[PDB]
Design a protein around this ligand. Sequence first.
Ligand SMILES: Nc1ncnc2c1ncn2[C@@H]1O[C@H](COP(=O)(O)OP(=O)(O)O)[C@@H](O)[C@H]1O
Ligand SMILES: Nc1ncnc2c1ncn2[C@@H]1O[C@H](COP(=O)(O)OP(=O)(O)O)[C@@H](O)[C@H]1O
Ligand SMILES: [Mg+2]
Ligand SMILES: [Mg+2]
Lengths: 369, 369
Amino acid sequence: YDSSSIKVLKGLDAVRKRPGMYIGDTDDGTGLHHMVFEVVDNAIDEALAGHCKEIIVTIHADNSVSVQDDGRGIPTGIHPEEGVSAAEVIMTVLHAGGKFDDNSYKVSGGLHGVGVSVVNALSQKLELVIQREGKIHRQIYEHGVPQAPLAVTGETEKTGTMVRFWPSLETFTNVTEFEYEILAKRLRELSFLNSGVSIRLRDKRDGKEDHFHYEGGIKAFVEYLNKNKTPIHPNIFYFSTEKDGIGVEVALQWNDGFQENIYCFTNNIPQRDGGTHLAGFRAAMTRTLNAYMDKEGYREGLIAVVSVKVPDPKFSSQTKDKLVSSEVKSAVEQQMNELLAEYLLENPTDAKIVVGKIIDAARAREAAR
Amino acid sequence: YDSSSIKVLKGLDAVRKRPGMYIGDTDDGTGLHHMVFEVVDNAIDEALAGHCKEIIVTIHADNSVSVQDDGRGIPTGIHPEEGVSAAEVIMTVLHAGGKFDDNSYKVSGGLHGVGVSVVNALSQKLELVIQREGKIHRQIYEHGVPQAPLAVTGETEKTGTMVRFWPSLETFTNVTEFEYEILAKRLRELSFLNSGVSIRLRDKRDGKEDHFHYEGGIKAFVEYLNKNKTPIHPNIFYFSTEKDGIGVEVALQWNDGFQENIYCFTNNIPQRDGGTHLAGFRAAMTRTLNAYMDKEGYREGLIAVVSVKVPDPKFSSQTKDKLVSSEVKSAVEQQMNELLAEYLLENPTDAKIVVGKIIDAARAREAAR
Ligand SMILES: Nc1ncnc2c1ncn2[C@@H]1O[C@H](COP(=O)(O)OP(=O)(O)O)[C@@H](O)[C@H]1O
Ligand SMILES: Nc1ncnc2c1ncn2[C@@H]1O[C@H](COP(=O)(O)OP(=O)(O)O)[C@@H](O)[C@H]1O
Ligand SMILES: [Mg+2]
Ligand SMILES: [Mg+2]
């Protein structure tokens, strides 16, 4: 034990040595599919910026997945400081990208500079095809190692990025094939969240195919989620605001069931473990309903979607399961307080049905004890 | 948007730009204290290896924390490939350390090669003092930047490492002072887990002080945890095995309360979010009790500690909240099946009390519905 015991891992080698701090669980399917999501998220960030209007996700018969976007294309020109194409830099260097300021993407779900480079690292093979600057470029990688320099292989009028990857089985175990339904659920949700972006999903294994292009936003997303439940009130509460540089968008409606289903998103990335947006939502829900009950003389069945747009959010893991930016709590909480109280005044009937379900649950416990 | 839009973050700059993927939540106190834990974990890994027998954690009156160990000392000699002292490499290079193989630490809670380097990155100041090779060495950093080369400042017979850091307030917000009790709880738990390592905690603010040197292992840890609850049975179930290169150690006892408190650890690091060790524990608990009930003609109040030793575990975030190595499920599950069934045969009285509480809960629901 001395100075020769200390090893430095360079390039993408650290990712292959310790995948879980980057990609999550490489044994239950979730990190495998998160590989796709990292790539799709980059396309989505072109769409947010206004440049991409179609996304095509294909599950190939050889268990690879491609994501095609019609955005601006990953930059192709030689990187001054690094001396190789900017595209190769992106694919091979951790904490390298165009989202560390707000000049290329005002708001974006990427922010770590590691996503596609992590997909590369954990792919036995990867294929990159970029249309920009009137040219088609293309490069191949194996286990993150470029096989040759980014190369012009044609002319075109189109711009866009195509990434196809075959995941390494020396990394992913147990669940090793892509599941249509997991990719579908995510891409469907993304369509509600990105009105006007055409998002296609194709399974070359059995020829199954979906085209998601929903137009009603998260309000329609809530209708969809209650399709085969029974909503107890007709008016879905909805608002979209931006104040103090934070966008807050909320839709919700109660059904006659007994589960709570709250979807939280930050710049289109889902938070399984919630966070400061969720905590603001709950605080405003509590405060607003209790003021409505005080004034009128007085969880279960709730479906809600909470989507925020934030210039530099903070997540407590690479995979972004929990948003931990505390100023986002205050933002959702005050926007919601204000607009939810207006909703209850403007729809007295909905208000009463909802408050009645709430009280029925309280009485039910009380009748038990 | 072109190749000049693509920025590379070098050294420790990425950590300062996106702290949460490394340190967790920098707004609620948890990441602040995790700074201490990263440093303490490195000491603990010397203890696991058999080299460190005392650890002194001091909260200083200027809100800095020092951790002193009597282990081998961070290597001081110039690193061949990197050309600076191995110690400076450790402090300044991500994914750099002595735990990527098993030559320096057979088992260890570190594994990413990033912990202390992350503490450095997020410290407005850091002080390193290393006793090895008959010399005292010392180096200072500010915001992760070394102020001068590692330097010999004396002779000594001792070996050990001292790290003192002052956390940056441009990173940590809301909770910015160290809380005695948070450090105490963790260090206490560590003492149960590392019998024979003297672990001291000193608060130079008010002169409060603790010395943790518990000898009964996780069995004693369970007694402690039930101190001020009421255990319903006298015999704490306990075992420590190592098979197939995985160590599994479990203690548990039921009290007459109604909460479940299961502490999981991997190579001494706690998993707030559980994982494959927890899932193995639960599977074996279910199977073993149901076989005991079948044979005898037939969560609440449980306290349990599950500690595993694994050569290369996999966590799904830098902060290690969830162990995601699936072979650890099978290991805990079979060791526990085997030894828990023996415990129930060997202590028929305990067995009956425990199974009676379990059934009482089932009946209570049933009497409700
Ligand atoms: N589909 C894409 N279209 C255009 N540019 C992209 C695309 N994917 C990646 N990039 C560029 O490569 C950069 C690095 O991507 P990534 O490594 O995934 O990190 P991040 O998205 O967190 O920056 C992005 O910031 C962006 O500038
Ligand atoms: N207290 C210590 N005593 C001896 N060596 C240490 C100590 N702390 C750190 N090191 C060495 O520095 C290396 C890098 O530490 P760190 O960056 O925290 O990553 P990791 O613990 O995951 O390797 C460790 O692997 C170890 O070799
Ligand atoms: Mg990305
Ligand atoms: Mg460490």
